[PDB]
Amino acid sequence: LPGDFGPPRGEPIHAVLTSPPLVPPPVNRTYPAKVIVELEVVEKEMQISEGVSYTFWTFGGTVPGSFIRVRQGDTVEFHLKNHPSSKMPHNIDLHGVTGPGGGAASSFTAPGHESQFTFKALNEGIYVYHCATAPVGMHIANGMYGLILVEPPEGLPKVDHEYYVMQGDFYTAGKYREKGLQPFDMEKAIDERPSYVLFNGAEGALTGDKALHAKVGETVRIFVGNGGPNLVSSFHVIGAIFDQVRYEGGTNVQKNVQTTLIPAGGAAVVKFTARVPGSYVLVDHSIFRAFNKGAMAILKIDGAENKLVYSGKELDSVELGDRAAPNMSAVTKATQASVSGTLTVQDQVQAGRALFAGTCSVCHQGNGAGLPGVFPPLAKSDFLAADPKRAMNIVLHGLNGKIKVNGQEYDSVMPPMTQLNDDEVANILTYVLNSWDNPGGRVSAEDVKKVRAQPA
Amino acid sequence: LPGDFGPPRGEPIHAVLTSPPLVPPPVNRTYPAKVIVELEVVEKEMQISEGVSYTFWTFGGTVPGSFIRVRQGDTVEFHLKNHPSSKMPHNIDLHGVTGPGGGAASSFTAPGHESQFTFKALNEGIYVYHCATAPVGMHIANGMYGLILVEPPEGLPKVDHEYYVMQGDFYTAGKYREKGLQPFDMEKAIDERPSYVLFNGAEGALTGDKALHAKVGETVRIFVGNGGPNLVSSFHVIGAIFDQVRYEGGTNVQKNVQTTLIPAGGAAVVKFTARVPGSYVLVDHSIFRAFNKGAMAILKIDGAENKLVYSGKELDSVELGDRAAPNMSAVTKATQASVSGTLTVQDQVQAGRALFAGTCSVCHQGNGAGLPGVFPPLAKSDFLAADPKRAMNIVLHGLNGKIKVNGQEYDSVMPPMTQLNDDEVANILTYVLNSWDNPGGRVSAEDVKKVRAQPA
Amino acid sequence: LPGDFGPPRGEPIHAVLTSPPLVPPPVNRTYPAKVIVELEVVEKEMQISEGVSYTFWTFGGTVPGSFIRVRQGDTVEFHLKNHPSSKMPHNIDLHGVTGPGGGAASSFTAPGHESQFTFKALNEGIYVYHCATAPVGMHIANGMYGLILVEPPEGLPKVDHEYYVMQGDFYTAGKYREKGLQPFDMEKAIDERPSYVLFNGAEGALTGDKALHAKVGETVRIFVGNGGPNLVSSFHVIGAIFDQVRYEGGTNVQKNVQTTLIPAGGAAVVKFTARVPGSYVLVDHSIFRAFNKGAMAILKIDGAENKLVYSGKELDSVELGDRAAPNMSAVTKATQASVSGTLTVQDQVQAGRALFAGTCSVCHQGNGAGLPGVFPPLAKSDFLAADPKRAMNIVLHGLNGKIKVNGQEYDSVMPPMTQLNDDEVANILTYVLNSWDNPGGRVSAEDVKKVRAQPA
């Protein structure tokens, strides 16, 4: 058969699996081997967004699951353990496996059990693996997917960096950024109406202090999966071009494209050469996913400017919003303090500072100064101080028509921002009230809930 | 012009059209011909799912419509009849036709009439045809699509089997698996929110006893259409790889891929070589389509195991759910008995037996034994027998926390299953009650409707 | 670097930008230049459909924005002005730019300001540009996208015509064809549930008297963008085939395909050779977009028939519906008259005449004659005249079962048409009542609103 290089030789190899966004070393081998893969399913609560918990079902404790790297022609002895704390049974289907279910019917594993099966890796390429346990959609939606690379016999060309990025669509009972432990929502999942669309299992998984890194002149290979369960990614890099895009083990290689479609369950290898420094954004260019549901990752390039190629500046909160900053840990802290009943004004101020970036600063500026006669100030604002309840109604329901702020007329339009949750409005307004010589005090989530329930 | 090999020669040929999933023989001809195609539109009720009727609008009595096979350079004299029982007018647009509407304006046909037009098949490839009558979306949604193959002059390479598979999205007033004659739902169609996503016009059209067949070592070509009207298919084969994928008459051929995107209105030729026995699942890998809306088809391969390639087992209800079994004819029978007012306990038991597979057996086992201390038993269950109403509430609304069943503690989570219809819950629980030394009796759809309307 | 042909030579060039659907001339240059691009953002109300206003945000006063044409290796000095009448700040991200944000962070521009940045056009291809100002999705949804062509050094092959077509998804508070000034709807946008899907910013932007034109034997190149923000286009030409399809600056060229997937944010160059006369329809083959949300454009080919290739007729209202006619200006006029409180019967009759095409004429004929015993007449209809309120209920809610019209029995089905707005039903029925020896009078939108609120 194609990809059959005879029986395993050398010694059995225990596969080294890596957590996203890292990749195991190149196999660097000229002979087929028996490769033993041990992967454990863990069900666990993790933060899908700041102050938002979700019960993920994982291969190896992460979303996506542990990266597996083997060579075409290898005999793979696959061990699937299900942690005793699990409530559900699980299995695995690996794309690129030649056999019914890609392993599913020989990997069915109850909590506290282990299964094994063996396959020959006949098909070179990058492949999605996922759980295949009824109801399959629920298992994939909860995070049960990852990538397996089957290298060609001669290996992939050498690059400076290899990274592991996987998109998924997620379905919570609550709205986007609604705090608390969020249940899986079967109705949204069947309707293909996700609340979150993420790289690597969380908002901000690959932004700020968790960005991917390279230097000017270096090559970067990214193994890009789409776990779905339902969405097709218009996968794109802002401000750069892919030297190459190869899907699964396909013979076709596209070169010099910026935007590529990755099917649900699909995988691609992309290659990038870093030319000028700054932040390069990976997005799903179905744009509300990227900028309203979490589908943004950063590759930060360090090194010398080249003004002959690009004269301009690094991104900030205008483009990246509240993900320009290293993290939003203050939001997590304020949500934990609300639960404990120890929420301070300063907890709200720091959370609001984080959330004000982009969301409000695009028009009002990072210092609240606005732009005289165009965008009114929030700094030392008489209009704000005069009526904090009115300010709650402005954030939720918008504002238009002639107003006077700090002695100047404005005649413009502030769009409604109803998608902000009650805690987010409360924290942003508490931040503004405690900044820039404003009168202090605080707005509570309960205050905003009342205004939302009866607009002015 | 390209594809013009001069005037028709030989004798006029009456085209032999085939019903899905079969394909007409290769044209096996070295000269261009006059090919006469006769296709009749029939509007008729058929079962879209067990006990679920739908008024399909068809080309030739099937969804997809009759397969048409001609040679590049042929002169095609196309006759479209509209059966006198039809209520709507119809026409045809064939992709690959050079001319306005692909035939639409010269094929407009009232009930009881016939139209004809002639075209030269200049463009080799596989092409969708469909109705193009206002409102076009409603006509396509009701089933009016099929494939035309225009062979290259030398013919396609020989294979062991050729099959015809076409995806469609469907829009019923009722929910998925809600029984009765279901009207078309224009609102769901405009919103692109299908209730069913199917291969060949019905749930189970290509599963169980209707699976496609081949043997180890054989080649299979599948002509794959996407009628839409609205969805793009992440078309995938579980447990295998496509040797080749060619779209329409494109010059590009992708080789060695498992997952491919087929546009709405698009068509592809895929080729598969059978290597090891078992069930190979064709799916839309937008996974809730495949596992919650009907988008699964089976190619069953018979022949010798090859343990060096794959050591594992054939699929069962864990992966295929209630489509692992040859058919679900008991569901059809119980739905007909409910309508007639002759529904017996045994009718409910056999329907429930069919629906229990995967849906319940993944956790509770096919024999209801569960797994001591992990998944509680439904076999001889004291907890079930103690309160059948509570069991209805468990299926609809789920269960969590500590319980005692047959003297053993469980402390786990059963997800809600609200997407099951009242008749499905009633039949599954009647099956369980009449199995495994349980106390018998019955649950009615009306019993479940009351519990659904007021949870415990 | 690739695409670097040294410093600019010759004289600085002021780029000539074109409004859709036209393209600037080929650069026709053998040396790299300094190209100065001046583009102004304008926020303005325009008609998205007849009698439906929308506040678009534009690059250069149009949707899509002004077409930019440069040569690979050019140094581009990009000037972005924001008109003083603007309420929002804006910026630009050009795909194909090597640098963070594709220009976004160096083009941020308040109302009444100007920004500039310089880049080297290293990457040949066709590229989307768009606004990248928080909230990015809202800016793109309001129309802020266009195309930039970076020619290869030797230029593109010569063709007879070059056109500029760009798809977008739009999100109004009101339903499709609901009259008035329609606000942007953030909720529909986040849910990816557009009310309109358009080429070039309006229904009918490229139909009727605004169709694209060519002659038999000519070559046509179309630069096709997908601004999104959210949808992927199953981009298709009815009745023809693309000689070539190239995405962005990709090395891959597909040849001889009819249906291609364009990602959100993607762009392609397609080439068509005109073979036989008539209307060739560009659509998103996610068919409810094309036939229920506005996603249809026409290339009209003039010249000699070739009966050996295609024996049939030009399209009419069966396929193109109310877009077969040169325009629907009567709908705009009646909507303006309703607002002014000067709506005449004749205003309603002319609007209804426009809306009757396809919507009603597919079954009842353009002259209201129907087809004896199959489709009842609206011409001199006793049944219509007997009860105009019943006729309102028939349009909204459908009709089935045995009726008698003009002495003949019908036993058929007219589907409900609830998606028609109150003014559309009122105008269509006023047209019918004032035609074909019917009794005249008028139906008002308020009459239809009452019937819709309580069906018979």
Ligand code: HEC
């Ligand atoms: C531009 C798109 C804006 C964004 C984003 C936000 N605001 Fe705004 N705001 C904007 C305008 C043009 C106006 C004036 C409207 C008019 O009728 O002319 C406002 C007004 C306010 C006000 C009241 C006036 C003042 O005190 O300066 C407040 C309190 C306010 N805006 C707050 C605010 C916050 C907290 C934001 C993020 C959540 C925010 N705005 C975003 C323009 C824009």
Ligand code: HEC
């Ligand atoms: C795993 C994902 C399950 C599926 C699918 C179904 N059930 Fe279940 N069930 C499951 C658990 C873990 C439990 C115990 C929950 C706890 O609090 O620990 C249950 C419980 C029941 C019961 C009650 C107890 C008993 O009699 O054993 C019933 C009656 C029951 N389940 C029925 C049932 C049916 C009919 C199913 C398909 C429709 C079904 N379950 C699916 C786990 C899982």
Ligand code: HEC
């Ligand atoms: C075919 C798909 C139709 C379209 C589109 C429209 N109508 Fe219709 N109409 C149709 C049928 C088959 C029937 C008879 C139904 C039956 O029970 O047999 C009708 C009936 C009417 C009537 C009443 C009878 C008459 O006066 O002829 C009216 C007033 C009517 N239809 C109007 C009408 C209008 C205004 C339409 C566009 C908005 C329209 N119809 C579309 C079939 C079809």
Ligand SMILES: O=N[O-]
């Ligand atoms: O390339 N911008 O999302």
Ligand SMILES: O=N[O-]
């Ligand atoms: O390949 N699994 O759906």
Ligand SMILES: O=N[O-]
């Ligand atoms: O090709 N028809 O939409």
Ligand SMILES: [Cu+2]
């Ligand atoms: Cu699982």
Ligand SMILES: [Cu+2]
């Ligand atoms: Cu899969």
Ligand SMILES: [Cu+2]
């Ligand atoms: Cu039809």
Ligand SMILES: [Cu+2]
């Ligand atoms: Cu079509």
Ligand SMILES: [Cu+2]
């Ligand atoms: Cu903008």
Ligand SMILES: [Cu+2]
């Ligand atoms: Cu972009």
